[PDB]
């Protein structure tokens, strides 16, 4: 109804990591029915970022995931009004991140207002020492609890010179109107920084997602 196969994205993130503030904004586009998207992100404050960019990328919209006919699509159903999400991320070395996103739609452009806050990242850790390479394929598990859609995920960042750095994601999704709620299902994610400048001021980000059951 308000979804075309080609959709635009505009966003601003405000946040802090270990009490050091920053701000990034982004512009991009995707194909909601194909579950593909890409965007260019520029750091506007707090640059150059003194931490691994990788902790941000997942904050940078489940509308962009291919849903099969036999699984309820909570996200596409939530427009034109939109929906929002809250999320906690607990890394195995005690660094903890919180984020929220409020998603509105203007014509054919999704608009994000994002808050991000990380704390307790050790100075000698892979995050503050920028030793991360990429997120491995992520399997997100979705279920309903007290009339709200929620998700769990056990993700992992590959590290410079081998090994992995683990993080547990917990997300709550809230449509702004009442929408049909899905049954239990999975979403596979591929997320990738395809190109960036040396200090990550500019970053070109890609994601591809498919739901399964």
From TrEMBL:
Keywords: Chromophore, Luminescence, Metal-binding, Photoprotein. InterPro entries: GFP (IPR009017), GFP-related (IPR011584), Green_fluorescent_prot (IPR000786). GO terms for molecular function: identical protein binding; metal ion binding. Gene3D superfamilies: 3.30.1300.40, Green fluorescent protein (2.40.155.10). GO terms for biological process: bioluminescence; generation of precursor metabolites and energy. SUPFAM superfamilies: GFP-like (SSF54511). The modification Phenylalanine amide is found at residue 60. It comes from the Eukaryota. Cu(2+) 2 binds at residues 206, 208. Cu(2+) 1 binds at residue 196. Belongs to the GFP family. This is Fluorescent protein Dronpa. It comes from Echinophyllia sp. SC22.
């Amino acid at each position: 109804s308000v979804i075309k196969p080609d959709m635009k994205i505009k966003l601003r993130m405000e946040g802090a990591v270990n009490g050091h503030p920053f701000a990034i904004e982004g512009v991009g586009l995707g194909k909601p029915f194909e579950g593909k998207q890409s965007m260019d992100l520029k750091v506007k404050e707090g640059g150059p970022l003194p931490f691994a960019y990788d902790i941000l990328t997942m904050a940078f919209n489940r509308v962009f995931a291919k849903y099969p006919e036999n699984i309820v699509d909570y996200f596409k159903q939530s427009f034109p009004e939109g929906y929002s999400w809250e999320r906690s991320m607990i890394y195995e070395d005690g660094g903890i991140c919180n984020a929220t996103n409020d998603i509105t739609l203007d014509g054919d452009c999704y608009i994000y207002e994002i808050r991000f806050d990380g704390v307790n990242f050790p100075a000698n850790g892979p995050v503050m020492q920028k030793r991360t390479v990429k997120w491995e394929l992520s399997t997100e598990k979705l279920y309903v609890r007290d009339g709200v859609l929620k998700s769990d995920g056990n993700y992992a960042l590959s590290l410079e010179g081998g090994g992995h750095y683990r993080c547990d994601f917990k997300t709550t999704y809230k449509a702004k109107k009442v929408v049909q709620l899905p049954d239990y299902h999975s979403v596979d994610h591929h997320i990738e920084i395809k190109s960036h400048d040396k200090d990550y001021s500019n970053v070109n980000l890609h994601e591809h997602a498919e739901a399964h059951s």
